[PDB]
Amino acid sequence: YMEQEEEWERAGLLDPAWEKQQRKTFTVWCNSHLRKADTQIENIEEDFRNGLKLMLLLEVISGETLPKPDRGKMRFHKIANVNKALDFIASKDVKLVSIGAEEIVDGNAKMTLGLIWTIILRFAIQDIEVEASTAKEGLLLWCQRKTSPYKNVNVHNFHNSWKDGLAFCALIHRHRPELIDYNSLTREDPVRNLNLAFDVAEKHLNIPKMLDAEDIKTSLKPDERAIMTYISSYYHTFA
């Protein structure tokens, strides 16, 4: 009973601020891959309902070919396409704990964001191996190692450790010192630091601006899934 709401709490999906952060961040992440297939989404709670761009997203990030999709106005075609997506994901050793094609075709916001996170996790994070840690803990360890020389960075988590922008700027500076005047930065202007990292990463590293500095600024504890999504692109660009 209320198993789904317990999982949604931990997913961040009951908090509307975290839901909004995931909606915005996940849309940019999906488009950072769909661009390679010359298309895009606009509204993540509408534009996957027929399964077509979901299947395409999975082909791009996996390099594999999925079965041919159906087309037709009628719902059962959309259900079939979403099920082809879900089958492909499950085939990569993913436990789809209560994600059904019907809710995706229905455009249920929480299930759709949960599904996109499942995809980000499996394909962008799960295989990360850093020392003896894997997946999310490996990604966090990478961040801790790469930012260890910076005295004004202390990465403990994927939320408030990232709020003042210095950790993002440090990750960039550690790989490319010529792009960031790191010593000029301080904790006093977090929005400046955040936007610096986001602008530099978009310009020089081809990493789109998945995070909104204003959403981070106003949150005492920003959404972990959104921040992990963005940092996963840092990881795969440098490592």
The residues spanned by each domain of the chain are 1-131, 132-239
Give which of 230, 235, 200, 186 is closest to 212, Cα–Cα. 230
Alpha helices (H) in 101-223, listed in sequence order: 101-105, 109-120, 135-146, 166-175, 190-205, 213-217
Long-range contacts of 56-61 (CB under 8 A, 24+ apart): 57/30, 57/33, 57/119, 58/85, 58/88, 58/89, 58/119, 60/33, 60/34, 60/36, 61/33, 61/119, 61/123, 61/124
In angstroms, the CA 211 to CA 159 distance is 12
Residue 98 in tokens = 């209560």
Residue 3 in tokens = 């198993």
In angstroms, the CA 125 to CA 151 distance is 27
| Experiment used for this model | X-ray
Q: CB atoms < 10 A from the CB of 9, how many?
A: 12
Strand pairing class (129-130; 133-134): antiparallel
Residue 53 in tokens = 């761009």
In angstroms, the CA 23 to CA 25 distance is 6
Q: How many helices (H) and strands (E) are present in the chain, helices listed first? A: 11, 2
In angstroms, the CA 168 to CA 234 distance is 9
In angstroms, the CA 125 to CA 121 distance is 5
In angstroms, the CA 196 to CA 213 distance is 10
- For residues 185 and 196, is the Cβ–Cβ distance under 8 A? yes
